[PDB]
């Protein structure tokens, strides 16, 4: 299934501050009104059983725009790399309940890797204790650790609130990260509206990444490499992925230097006029 990613995917093209000016630049962006592929998580159901837990590997292409609405923070992180198998370095980003760790190691990835928080019956607590991205790792080039943070560990299903968007691109071998998080509690699941993403982190790794996979997580379930989506599954969650393309855009900087709007130049003849 596909959904309309109307406006989203715009981010500050550069570090430079600009104000009250319309500047045109060319980078890899998500074309307006492009289809995005919707991935889903379904809880076990009746005999038919809708239940889905979608963690396939997807192509890295030029760059990926990733957005998710999570009932609970089922989605722990992503994997980037060509093989996603050892004997090659691969980017691995996972957030345990405590913090975020980014690591390049030549990990021994499981066939179906995932993470997880388990929800205990006796008490309310949600705890992450399922971490099976990889069996082992060697020759680790770079590693980073974030601060502690709190997220939804427990299994819950729906796209009630948190809306998180990210842009992953490579610039001169650079791995760039952009993000914007806005709650869409009232807001529609993958809403229509415009928001700009700003760069969080710089990863100088220089990994050539062909493909990436998203890692869903729920500690209610145990993990072994070779786990073929068996066992219990996490609450409902949906994430989207789109592909960036070289295109021109006209960005509108407000007084603040915030990007209020944008025009997809190529989108249509009307949009082209706006460009000139």
């Amino acid at each position, epitope marked *: 299934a596909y959904t309309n990613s109307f406006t989203r995917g715009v981010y500050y093209p550069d570090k430079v501050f600009r104000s009250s000016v319309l500047h045109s630049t060319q980078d890899l962006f998500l074309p307006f009104f492009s289809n995005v592929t919707w991935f889903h998580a379904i809880h076990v159901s009746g005999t038919n059983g809708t239940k889905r837990f979608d963690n396939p590997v997807l192509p890295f292409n030029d760059g990926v725009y990733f957005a998710s609405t999570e009932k609970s923070n089922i989605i722990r992180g992503w994997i980037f790399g060509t093989t996603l198998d050892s004997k090659t370095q691969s980017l691995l980003i996972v957030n345990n309940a405590t913090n975020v760790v980014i690591k390049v190691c030549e990990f021994q990835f499981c066939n179906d890797p995932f993470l997880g928080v388990y929800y205990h019956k006796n008490n309310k607590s949600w705890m992450e204790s399922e971490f099976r991205v990889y069996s082992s790792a060697n020759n680790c080039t770079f590693e980073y650790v974030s601060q502690p943070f709190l997220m939804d560990l427990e299994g819950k299903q729906g796209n*009630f609130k948190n809306l998180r968007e990210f842009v992953f691109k490579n610039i001169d071998g650079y791995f760039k990260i952009y993000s914007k998080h806005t709650p869409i509690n009232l807001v*529609r699941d993958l809403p229509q509206g415009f928001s700009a993403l700003e760069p969080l982190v710089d990863l100088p790794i220089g990994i050539n990444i062909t493909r990436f996979q998203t890692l869903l997580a729920l500690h209610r379930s145990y993990l072994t490499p070779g786990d073929s989506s068996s066992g219990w599954t996490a609450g409902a969650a949906a994430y989207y992925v789109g592909y960036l393309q070289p295109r021109t855009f006209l960005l509108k900087y407000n007084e603040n230097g915030t990007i209020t709007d944008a025009v997809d130049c190529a989108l249509d003849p009307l949009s082209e006029t706006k460009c000139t």
Partner: antibody
Amino acid sequence: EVQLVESGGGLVQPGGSLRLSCAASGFTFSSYWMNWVRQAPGKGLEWVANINQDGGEKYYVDSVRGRFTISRDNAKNSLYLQMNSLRAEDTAVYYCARDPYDLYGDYGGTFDYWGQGTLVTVSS
Amino acid sequence: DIQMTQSPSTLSASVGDRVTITCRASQSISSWLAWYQQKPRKAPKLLIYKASTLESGVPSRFSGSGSGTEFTLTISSLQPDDFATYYCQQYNSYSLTFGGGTKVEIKR
């Protein structure tokens, strides 16, 4: 016969609590989300609360958030709604309805089956 | 959030005529709209889902269409049974919301 029978309505003073229950039959209860919707007579129909099939994920309307808790006992084939700090405003007829899966998203079917309703009155 | 506003709030039509109730969302719900029929004191019954899919067992007289933000439930040949209040709802995003309700009455 898919059926939903609600019980527990009554007269309640402000501050009080009640728990309504809805016994379901005719389908695999464990596999579906259940919701509680209320119709307060002068006003209209309002969606109160929802629970995921697993029973973990639970959502509520803002007015009720601290006050109401929805829960279910699959073995029991029963759904419950415990209410607290009742206000005069909560007076309404409460219906238990079987909801669609949110996952369906743009193609949501809405609530297929509904119960007769339990009337709760909050007055001094 | 999203507000659904139905119109007209009330209408009276003769038997056999075509009735059209509209519902307008504050913002794009997409296809996420359903319609319900409610009789006095009785619980609501689901007429349509996904804007135009007839629920099982519902009479063919009822149909629902929609595009954009605006959706319409039409009743091709009004019958006396049809007396009721009809509500639209949008499942698109939380919280779930119902329209005000349109009361239909048989004109005599």
